[PDB]
Amino acid sequence: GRVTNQLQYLHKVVMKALWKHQFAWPFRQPVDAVKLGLPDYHKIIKQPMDMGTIKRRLENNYYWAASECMQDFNTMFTNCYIYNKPTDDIVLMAQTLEKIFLQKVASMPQEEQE
């Protein structure tokens, strides 16, 4: 439970950009395995992650460190690559979003503090 300059950057710069992205819609809420017809989803993916969860954690001071937040972003993207077929559009969508995520992390301010 902490607010830092990096957490504020992850929230207000990085997440804000990804959230509004045209490929973001599948990732803004938990995967709904019922609605989507995916009865094996929770057998394969043991740690579901989504932007809504990450955003709410940033608003509620759940994270102590930027790295913790970056790990949740990574789990979200990795779940997608692991669950889905190589040829699924969703995989391309996740790669596109993940490249922005990495690009933005490369300009995160580096006085990890608060």
Add this chain to the structure above:
Amino acid sequence: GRVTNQLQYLHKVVMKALWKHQFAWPFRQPVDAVKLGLPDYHKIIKQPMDMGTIKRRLENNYYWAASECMQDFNTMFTNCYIYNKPTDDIVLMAQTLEKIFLQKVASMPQEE
């Protein structure tokens, strides 16, 4: 070339930690589909990436920005998750290495 603080950090902290990790050996050279009996590998993975290539690139000043090297690390990890079965050990190895990657990149100096 002079080497930005970020690329120096990627070389001396990130690659340093990953290259010597005990889970690193599958990733140190390009995947050999012949040796590994993986006829579909190059059909699924269109951009192979490996730590030997990235390390070479870091030594020979191939990179113009940190994000470029970081993209290569990401491609290497993602290749693995896309090609391999969810239950393969290699996936667990990749995840562990990628966690270190992200942890270190969290503390990377600022650009410029």
